[PDB]
């Protein structure tokens, strides 16, 4: 198995640059929290 | 074992005997103390003695000091227990040249 091992390597996202990570976490959790808001908006704009 | 229980005097004896084994090694010395500490009691001076002497046999000064610290910690809020112990251990303490944690200043932060 050419699967790398150890801290920061057993995850599907890069943890090498703390700020790239910051961006990714922000989009990840961010898009998840915003979805309901935009769905309600979408429903409010129909007819 | 199961259902079979000892009286206090037997418990103590069993411990004094344990610590007195001449060919006792470091492992058994650690096991014994580490085990004794899981119980609901501050060990009798006589058990502590045997352990302090075992420390001497193994030329281990530091463990002898840590043993006394444990005795105090185990007394919890019962201030009167430690001094009485040290009192009964005074002879051995002097004979073996063992310093109390208080004397070494290890009781301060």
């Amino acid at each position: 198995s050419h699967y790398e091992e150890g801290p920061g390597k057993n995850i599907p996202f890069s943890v090498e640059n703390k700020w790239r990570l910051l961006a990714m976490m922000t989009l990840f959790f961010g898009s998840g929290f915003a979805a309901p808001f935009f769905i309600v908006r979408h429903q409010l704009l129909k007819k | 074992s199961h259902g079979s229980h000892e009286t206090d005097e037997e418990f103590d004896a069993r411990w004094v005997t344990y610590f007195n084994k001449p060919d006792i090694d470091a492992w058994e010395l650690r096991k014994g103390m580490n085990t004794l500490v899981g119980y609901d009691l501050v060990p009798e001076p006589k058990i502590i003695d045997a352990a302090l002497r075992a420390c001497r046999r193994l030329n281990d000064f530091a463990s002898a000091v840590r043993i006394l610290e444990v005795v105090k910690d185990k007394a919890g809020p019962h201030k009167e227990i430690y001094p009485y112990v040290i009192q009964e251990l005074r002879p051995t303490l002097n004979e073996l040249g063992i310093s109390t944690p208080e004397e070494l200043g290890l009781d301060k932060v």
Partner: protein
Amino acid sequence: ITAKPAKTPTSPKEQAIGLSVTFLSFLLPAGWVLYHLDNYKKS
């Protein structure tokens, strides 16, 4: 549980940044949509 010191420590400034960003990413989008609710309710 013991651990080695941080290989790449995060100074307070760095934390303050990550904390602010983390907050904004949650509060902004929702705030915007919520801010315009009436416009939606009136088409």
